[PDB]
Short mmCIF file of N, CA and C and ligand atoms in Angstrom, two decimals:
data_model
loop_
_atom_site.label_atom_id
_atom_site.label_comp_id
_atom_site.label_asym_id
_atom_site.label_seq_id
_atom_site.Cartn_x
_atom_site.Cartn_y
_atom_site.Cartn_z
N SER A 1 4.59 11.68 6.99
CA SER A 1 3.56 10.75 6.54
C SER A 1 3.42 9.62 7.55
N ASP A 2 2.25 8.99 7.61
CA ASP A 2 1.99 8.04 8.67
C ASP A 2 1.94 6.60 8.19
N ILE A 3 2.40 6.32 6.97
CA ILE A 3 2.36 4.96 6.43
C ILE A 3 3.77 4.52 6.04
N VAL A 4 4.08 3.25 6.34
CA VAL A 4 5.34 2.60 5.98
C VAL A 4 5.03 1.19 5.49
N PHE A 5 6.05 0.52 4.97
CA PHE A 5 5.99 -0.92 4.74
C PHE A 5 7.16 -1.53 5.52
N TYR A 6 6.86 -2.10 6.68
CA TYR A 6 7.87 -2.67 7.58
C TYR A 6 9.04 -1.71 7.76
N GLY A 7 8.72 -0.45 8.04
CA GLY A 7 9.70 0.56 8.36
C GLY A 7 10.23 1.35 7.18
N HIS A 8 9.76 1.09 5.96
CA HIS A 8 10.32 1.70 4.76
C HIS A 8 9.25 2.51 4.03
N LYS A 9 9.64 3.68 3.52
CA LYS A 9 8.73 4.61 2.88
C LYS A 9 9.06 4.90 1.42
N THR A 10 10.24 4.54 0.95
CA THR A 10 10.64 4.89 -0.40
C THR A 10 10.62 3.66 -1.29
N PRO A 11 10.36 3.82 -2.59
CA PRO A 11 10.32 2.65 -3.48
C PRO A 11 11.58 1.80 -3.42
N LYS A 12 12.77 2.42 -3.46
CA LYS A 12 13.98 1.61 -3.50
C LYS A 12 14.21 0.87 -2.18
N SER A 13 13.96 1.52 -1.05
CA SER A 13 14.14 0.81 0.22
C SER A 13 13.14 -0.32 0.37
N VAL A 14 11.92 -0.14 -0.15
CA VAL A 14 10.96 -1.24 -0.14
C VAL A 14 11.41 -2.36 -1.08
N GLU A 15 11.91 -1.99 -2.27
CA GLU A 15 12.38 -3.00 -3.22
C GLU A 15 13.53 -3.80 -2.62
N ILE A 16 14.46 -3.12 -1.95
CA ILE A 16 15.58 -3.81 -1.30
C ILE A 16 15.08 -4.73 -0.19
N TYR A 17 14.14 -4.26 0.63
CA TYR A 17 13.56 -5.11 1.67
C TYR A 17 12.98 -6.39 1.08
N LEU A 18 12.17 -6.24 0.03
CA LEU A 18 11.52 -7.42 -0.56
C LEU A 18 12.55 -8.34 -1.20
N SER A 19 13.51 -7.77 -1.92
CA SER A 19 14.51 -8.57 -2.61
C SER A 19 15.34 -9.38 -1.62
N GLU A 20 15.76 -8.74 -0.52
CA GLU A 20 16.58 -9.45 0.45
C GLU A 20 15.80 -10.53 1.19
N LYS A 21 14.47 -10.44 1.21
CA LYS A 21 13.64 -11.52 1.73
C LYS A 21 13.25 -12.51 0.65
N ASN A 22 13.83 -12.39 -0.55
CA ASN A 22 13.55 -13.29 -1.67
C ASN A 22 12.07 -13.29 -2.05
N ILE A 23 11.42 -12.15 -1.91
CA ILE A 23 10.05 -11.99 -2.36
C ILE A 23 10.06 -11.42 -3.77
N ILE A 24 9.35 -12.08 -4.68
CA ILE A 24 9.24 -11.60 -6.05
C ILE A 24 8.21 -10.48 -6.10
N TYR A 25 8.50 -9.44 -6.89
CA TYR A 25 7.56 -8.33 -7.01
C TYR A 25 7.61 -7.78 -8.42
N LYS A 26 6.55 -7.08 -8.78
CA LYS A 26 6.44 -6.39 -10.06
C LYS A 26 6.29 -4.91 -9.79
N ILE A 27 6.89 -4.09 -10.65
CA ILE A 27 6.85 -2.64 -10.51
C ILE A 27 6.12 -2.06 -11.71
N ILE A 28 5.14 -1.20 -11.44
CA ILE A 28 4.51 -0.41 -12.49
C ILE A 28 4.62 1.06 -12.13
N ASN A 29 4.55 1.91 -13.15
CA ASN A 29 4.75 3.33 -12.93
C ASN A 29 4.07 4.11 -14.04
N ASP A 30 4.05 5.43 -13.89
CA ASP A 30 3.48 6.32 -14.90
C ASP A 30 4.55 7.00 -15.75
N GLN A 31 5.74 6.41 -15.87
CA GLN A 31 6.77 7.08 -16.66
C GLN A 31 6.40 7.13 -18.14
N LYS A 32 5.86 6.05 -18.69
CA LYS A 32 5.47 6.09 -20.09
C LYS A 32 4.22 6.95 -20.28
N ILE A 33 3.24 6.81 -19.38
CA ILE A 33 2.01 7.62 -19.44
C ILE A 33 2.35 9.10 -19.51
N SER A 34 3.26 9.54 -18.65
CA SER A 34 3.62 10.95 -18.55
C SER A 34 4.70 11.36 -19.53
N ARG A 35 5.24 10.42 -20.31
CA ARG A 35 6.37 10.65 -21.20
C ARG A 35 7.55 11.28 -20.46
N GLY A 36 7.95 10.65 -19.36
CA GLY A 36 9.22 11.00 -18.76
C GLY A 36 9.15 11.59 -17.37
N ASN A 37 8.14 12.40 -17.08
CA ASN A 37 8.05 13.04 -15.76
C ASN A 37 6.98 12.32 -14.95
N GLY A 38 7.36 11.15 -14.44
CA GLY A 38 6.43 10.34 -13.67
C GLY A 38 6.39 10.73 -12.20
N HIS A 39 5.25 10.46 -11.58
CA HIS A 39 5.06 10.73 -10.17
C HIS A 39 4.56 9.52 -9.39
N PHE A 40 4.23 8.42 -10.06
CA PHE A 40 3.59 7.28 -9.42
C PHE A 40 4.43 6.03 -9.63
N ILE A 41 4.61 5.27 -8.56
CA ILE A 41 5.18 3.94 -8.62
C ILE A 41 4.31 3.05 -7.75
N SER A 42 3.98 1.86 -8.26
CA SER A 42 3.31 0.86 -7.44
C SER A 42 4.07 -0.45 -7.53
N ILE A 43 4.26 -1.08 -6.37
CA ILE A 43 4.94 -2.36 -6.27
C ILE A 43 3.90 -3.39 -5.88
N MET A 44 3.89 -4.53 -6.57
CA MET A 44 2.89 -5.57 -6.36
C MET A 44 3.57 -6.85 -5.89
N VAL A 45 3.04 -7.44 -4.84
CA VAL A 45 3.48 -8.75 -4.37
C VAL A 45 2.26 -9.63 -4.20
N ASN A 46 2.47 -10.94 -4.33
CA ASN A 46 1.42 -11.93 -4.15
C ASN A 46 1.76 -12.86 -2.98
N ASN A 47 0.71 -13.40 -2.36
CA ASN A 47 0.84 -14.47 -1.35
C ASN A 47 1.76 -14.07 -0.20
N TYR A 48 1.51 -12.90 0.37
CA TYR A 48 2.31 -12.35 1.47
C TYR A 48 1.61 -12.63 2.79
N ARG A 49 2.33 -13.20 3.75
CA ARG A 49 1.70 -13.57 5.02
C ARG A 49 1.54 -12.34 5.91
N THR A 50 0.30 -12.03 6.28
CA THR A 50 -0.05 -10.95 7.19
C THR A 50 -0.99 -11.49 8.26
N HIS A 51 -1.37 -10.62 9.20
CA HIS A 51 -2.35 -10.99 10.21
C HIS A 51 -3.77 -11.03 9.67
N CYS A 52 -4.00 -10.56 8.46
CA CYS A 52 -5.26 -10.81 7.78
C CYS A 52 -5.19 -12.07 6.92
N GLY A 53 -4.12 -12.84 7.03
CA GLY A 53 -3.93 -14.03 6.22
C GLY A 53 -2.92 -13.83 5.11
N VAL A 54 -2.88 -14.82 4.22
CA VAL A 54 -2.00 -14.77 3.06
C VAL A 54 -2.71 -13.94 1.99
N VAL A 55 -2.10 -12.82 1.60
CA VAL A 55 -2.81 -11.82 0.80
C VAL A 55 -1.90 -11.30 -0.30
N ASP A 56 -2.52 -10.66 -1.28
CA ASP A 56 -1.78 -9.91 -2.27
C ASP A 56 -1.72 -8.45 -1.82
N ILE A 57 -0.64 -7.77 -2.18
CA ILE A 57 -0.37 -6.43 -1.66
C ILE A 57 0.04 -5.51 -2.80
N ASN A 58 -0.52 -4.30 -2.81
CA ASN A 58 0.00 -3.20 -3.61
C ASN A 58 0.56 -2.15 -2.68
N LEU A 59 1.76 -1.67 -3.01
CA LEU A 59 2.43 -0.59 -2.29
C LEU A 59 2.49 0.59 -3.24
N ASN A 60 1.81 1.67 -2.89
CA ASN A 60 1.55 2.76 -3.82
C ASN A 60 2.29 4.00 -3.37
N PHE A 61 3.12 4.55 -4.26
CA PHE A 61 4.02 5.66 -3.97
C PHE A 61 3.69 6.86 -4.86
N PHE A 62 3.76 8.06 -4.29
CA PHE A 62 3.58 9.31 -5.02
C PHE A 62 4.79 10.18 -4.73
N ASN A 63 5.48 10.62 -5.77
CA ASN A 63 6.71 11.40 -5.60
C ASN A 63 7.67 10.67 -4.66
N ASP A 64 7.76 9.35 -4.84
CA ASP A 64 8.70 8.48 -4.14
C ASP A 64 8.41 8.37 -2.65
N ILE A 65 7.17 8.63 -2.23
CA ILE A 65 6.74 8.46 -0.85
C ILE A 65 5.50 7.58 -0.82
N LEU A 66 5.52 6.57 0.05
CA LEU A 66 4.38 5.66 0.18
C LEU A 66 3.15 6.43 0.65
N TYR A 67 2.03 6.27 -0.06
CA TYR A 67 0.78 6.82 0.43
C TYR A 67 -0.28 5.77 0.74
N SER A 68 -0.10 4.53 0.28
CA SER A 68 -1.15 3.53 0.39
C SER A 68 -0.53 2.13 0.40
N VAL A 69 -0.99 1.28 1.32
CA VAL A 69 -0.65 -0.14 1.35
C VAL A 69 -1.97 -0.88 1.29
N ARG A 70 -2.22 -1.60 0.21
CA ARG A 70 -3.50 -2.27 0.01
C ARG A 70 -3.34 -3.78 0.13
N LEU A 71 -4.04 -4.37 1.09
CA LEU A 71 -4.13 -5.82 1.21
C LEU A 71 -5.33 -6.29 0.40
N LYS A 72 -5.14 -7.32 -0.44
CA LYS A 72 -6.17 -7.75 -1.37
C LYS A 72 -6.54 -9.21 -1.14
N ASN A 73 -7.83 -9.52 -1.32
CA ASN A 73 -8.34 -10.89 -1.40
C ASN A 73 -8.30 -11.56 -0.03
N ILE A 74 -8.91 -10.90 0.96
CA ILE A 74 -9.06 -11.41 2.32
C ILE A 74 -10.39 -12.14 2.43
N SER A 75 -10.40 -13.27 3.12
CA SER A 75 -11.61 -14.07 3.24
C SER A 75 -12.74 -13.27 3.87
N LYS A 76 -13.95 -13.44 3.32
CA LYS A 76 -15.14 -12.84 3.93
C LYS A 76 -15.43 -13.42 5.30
N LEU A 77 -14.81 -14.54 5.67
CA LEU A 77 -14.98 -15.10 7.00
C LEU A 77 -13.94 -14.57 8.00
N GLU A 78 -13.09 -13.64 7.58
CA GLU A 78 -12.09 -13.05 8.46
C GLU A 78 -12.72 -11.96 9.32
N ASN A 79 -12.30 -11.88 10.59
CA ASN A 79 -12.67 -10.76 11.46
C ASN A 79 -11.91 -9.53 10.98
N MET A 80 -12.60 -8.63 10.29
CA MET A 80 -11.90 -7.59 9.54
C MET A 80 -11.37 -6.49 10.45
N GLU A 81 -12.17 -6.00 11.39
CA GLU A 81 -11.67 -4.95 12.28
C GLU A 81 -10.50 -5.47 13.11
N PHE A 82 -10.55 -6.73 13.52
CA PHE A 82 -9.46 -7.27 14.32
C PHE A 82 -8.21 -7.48 13.48
N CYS A 83 -8.34 -8.09 12.30
CA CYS A 83 -7.14 -8.35 11.53
C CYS A 83 -6.55 -7.05 10.99
N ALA A 84 -7.40 -6.09 10.62
CA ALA A 84 -6.91 -4.79 10.15
C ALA A 84 -6.16 -4.06 11.26
N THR A 85 -6.70 -4.05 12.48
CA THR A 85 -6.01 -3.36 13.57
C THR A 85 -4.75 -4.11 13.98
N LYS A 86 -4.76 -5.44 13.89
CA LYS A 86 -3.60 -6.24 14.26
C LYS A 86 -2.44 -6.03 13.29
N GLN A 87 -2.73 -5.88 12.00
CA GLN A 87 -1.68 -5.66 11.02
C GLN A 87 -1.21 -4.21 10.98
N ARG A 88 -1.98 -3.30 11.57
CA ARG A 88 -1.80 -1.87 11.34
C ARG A 88 -0.39 -1.38 11.70
N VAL A 89 0.17 -1.87 12.82
CA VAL A 89 1.45 -1.33 13.29
C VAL A 89 2.55 -1.51 12.25
N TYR A 90 2.47 -2.57 11.44
CA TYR A 90 3.53 -2.83 10.48
C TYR A 90 3.49 -1.87 9.31
N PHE A 91 2.36 -1.20 9.10
CA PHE A 91 2.24 -0.23 8.03
C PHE A 91 2.13 1.20 8.56
N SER A 92 2.38 1.40 9.85
CA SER A 92 2.26 2.70 10.48
C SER A 92 3.63 3.29 10.77
N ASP A 93 3.78 4.58 10.47
CA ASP A 93 4.93 5.32 10.97
C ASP A 93 4.97 5.23 12.49
N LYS A 94 6.19 5.23 13.04
CA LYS A 94 6.35 5.17 14.49
C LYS A 94 5.65 6.33 15.20
N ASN A 95 5.42 7.44 14.51
CA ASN A 95 4.80 8.63 15.10
C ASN A 95 3.29 8.55 15.14
N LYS A 96 2.68 7.78 14.25
CA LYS A 96 1.26 7.97 14.01
C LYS A 96 0.72 6.77 13.24
N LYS A 97 -0.44 6.29 13.66
CA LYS A 97 -1.05 5.13 13.02
C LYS A 97 -1.55 5.49 11.63
N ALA A 98 -1.39 4.57 10.69
CA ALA A 98 -1.99 4.75 9.37
C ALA A 98 -3.51 4.65 9.47
N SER A 99 -4.20 5.40 8.61
CA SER A 99 -5.63 5.20 8.45
C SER A 99 -5.88 3.90 7.70
N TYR A 100 -7.10 3.38 7.79
CA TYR A 100 -7.42 2.23 6.96
C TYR A 100 -8.91 2.21 6.65
N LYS A 101 -9.23 1.57 5.53
CA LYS A 101 -10.59 1.41 5.04
C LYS A 101 -10.78 -0.05 4.64
N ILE A 102 -11.85 -0.65 5.12
CA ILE A 102 -12.25 -2.00 4.72
C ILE A 102 -13.14 -1.89 3.49
N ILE A 103 -12.81 -2.64 2.45
CA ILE A 103 -13.50 -2.54 1.16
C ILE A 103 -14.13 -3.89 0.86
N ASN A 104 -15.46 -3.92 0.79
CA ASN A 104 -16.19 -5.17 0.63
C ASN A 104 -16.44 -5.41 -0.85
N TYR A 105 -15.91 -6.51 -1.37
CA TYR A 105 -16.16 -6.93 -2.74
C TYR A 105 -17.24 -8.00 -2.82
N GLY A 106 -17.90 -8.32 -1.71
CA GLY A 106 -18.90 -9.36 -1.68
C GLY A 106 -18.32 -10.74 -1.41
N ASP A 107 -17.50 -11.23 -2.33
CA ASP A 107 -16.87 -12.53 -2.16
C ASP A 107 -15.59 -12.47 -1.34
N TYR A 108 -15.08 -11.28 -1.06
CA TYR A 108 -13.82 -11.11 -0.34
C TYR A 108 -13.71 -9.65 0.06
N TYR A 109 -12.70 -9.35 0.87
CA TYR A 109 -12.40 -7.99 1.30
C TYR A 109 -11.02 -7.57 0.81
N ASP A 110 -10.86 -6.27 0.61
CA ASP A 110 -9.56 -5.62 0.64
C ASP A 110 -9.50 -4.72 1.86
N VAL A 111 -8.29 -4.47 2.34
CA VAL A 111 -8.03 -3.43 3.33
C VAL A 111 -7.01 -2.48 2.74
N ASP A 112 -7.38 -1.21 2.64
CA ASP A 112 -6.47 -0.18 2.18
C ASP A 112 -6.00 0.62 3.39
N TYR A 113 -4.71 0.54 3.69
CA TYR A 113 -4.05 1.44 4.62
C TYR A 113 -3.54 2.66 3.87
N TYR A 114 -3.64 3.83 4.48
CA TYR A 114 -3.25 5.02 3.72
C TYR A 114 -2.98 6.17 4.66
N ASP A 115 -2.20 7.12 4.17
CA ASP A 115 -2.03 8.43 4.80
C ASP A 115 -3.08 9.36 4.21
N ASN A 116 -4.00 9.83 5.05
CA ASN A 116 -5.15 10.58 4.55
C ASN A 116 -4.72 11.86 3.84
N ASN A 117 -3.75 12.58 4.40
CA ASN A 117 -3.27 13.80 3.76
C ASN A 117 -2.63 13.50 2.42
N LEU A 118 -1.73 12.52 2.38
CA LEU A 118 -1.06 12.19 1.13
C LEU A 118 -2.07 11.71 0.09
N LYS A 119 -3.03 10.89 0.50
CA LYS A 119 -4.01 10.38 -0.46
C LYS A 119 -4.86 11.51 -1.02
N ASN A 120 -5.22 12.48 -0.19
CA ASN A 120 -5.95 13.64 -0.71
C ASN A 120 -5.10 14.45 -1.69
N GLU A 121 -3.80 14.58 -1.40
CA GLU A 121 -2.88 15.23 -2.34
C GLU A 121 -2.85 14.52 -3.68
N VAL A 122 -2.80 13.18 -3.66
CA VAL A 122 -2.81 12.41 -4.89
C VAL A 122 -4.09 12.68 -5.68
N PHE A 123 -5.24 12.64 -4.99
CA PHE A 123 -6.50 12.91 -5.66
C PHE A 123 -6.53 14.33 -6.23
N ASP A 124 -6.11 15.31 -5.43
CA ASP A 124 -6.05 16.69 -5.91
C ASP A 124 -5.15 16.80 -7.13
N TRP A 125 -4.00 16.13 -7.09
CA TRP A 125 -3.05 16.21 -8.19
C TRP A 125 -3.63 15.62 -9.47
N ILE A 126 -4.32 14.48 -9.36
CA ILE A 126 -4.93 13.86 -10.53
C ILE A 126 -5.98 14.77 -11.15
N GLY A 127 -6.80 15.42 -10.33
CA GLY A 127 -7.82 16.30 -10.87
C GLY A 127 -7.24 17.53 -11.53
N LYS A 128 -6.10 18.01 -11.03
CA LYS A 128 -5.45 19.21 -11.56
C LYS A 128 -4.75 18.94 -12.88
N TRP A 129 -4.08 17.79 -13.00
CA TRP A 129 -3.18 17.54 -14.12
C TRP A 129 -3.74 16.55 -15.13
N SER A 130 -4.98 16.12 -14.96
CA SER A 130 -5.65 15.32 -15.96
C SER A 130 -6.96 16.00 -16.37
CL1 LIG B 201 8.80 -5.59 -12.55
#
């Protein structure tokens, strides 16, 4: 997979990274939704300093592998292609750059970094099992 969070791809290693940096985070998952056999974990942090500014972040995992890093609430006055490309290396596997999509909400932007293959697998899985 081509996406990491500062070198980490698994929920627990990401949780340890954030905890040791004294960053508060919230964890949500599909364990109750699925009644026991969950496949999704998302970790949420607020006010995280990136090259797109101070942003909120979701770290999205499928089968304990990161597939998506979403930066939220970026100023509409930010140079989006520049800040997205500047932050990219920190969310990219050493082998391969993560993909990214700029999402315009009108009053602000999100940037979603993602592994295209993994994200397609997630979409395929949702359509199959729901
Ligand atoms: Cl939590």
